[PDB]
Amino acid sequence: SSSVPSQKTYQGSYGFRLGFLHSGTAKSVTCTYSPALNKLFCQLAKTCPVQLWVDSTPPPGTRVRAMAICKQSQHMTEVVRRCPHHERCSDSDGLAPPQHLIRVEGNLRAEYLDDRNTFRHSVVVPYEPPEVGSDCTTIHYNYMCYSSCMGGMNRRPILTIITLEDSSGNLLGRDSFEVRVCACPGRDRRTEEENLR
Ligand SMILES: [Zn+2]
């Protein structure tokens, strides 16, 4: 009735870790990642490219799961879901449950899970190796509530946990990042980094 997934970074046998575009903080950026904060800033329901880097190719049937949790210990048993307003909106892509914060864009093989025991939401896709001309695999995520949505992200720091799993669900790798969904990611990142003095 209470639990939390592990957030322990784990590179594993295949050298798994995340990467992000180096987009800077101009006002026009639709998303941007802060290395100093390990924090992705993005806009509501827009493309967030997240890169999967491995040193060696994982086995057939490997999968990539994303799940959101509250970062603070006093809230980590609370399931992260969309707020009442956005859950009722007509923004369904035909695949994602209306309550799920995290969607995958542009992948018809995305699978969405309400865990039967923990009730937590996640979205999982097949692992694909990098395409011709690329050195990493990119997943396009969408975050479907704002950080300020009460009943949703609740103005709480939220962590996204990305896990590399084998076909049976066993852990092969894990990485994570804080996520802020906001109107102007470039300005918000530069403002939060200004305090790093
Ligand atoms: Zn919302």
Residue numbers in the entry: 94 to 290
What does the original paper state about this entry?
The tumor suppressor p53 is inactivated by mutation in about half of all cancer cases. Most p53 cancer mutations are missense mutations clustering in the DNA-binding domain (DBD). Due to its low intrinsic stability, the human p53 DBD is very susceptible to inactivation by destabilizing mutations, resulting in unfolding, followed by rapid aggregation at body temperature. Here, we have systematically analyzed the structural and stability effects of all oncogenic Tyr-to-Cys mutations (Y126C, Y163C, Y205C, Y220C, Y234C, and Y236C) in the p53 DNA-binding domain (DBD).
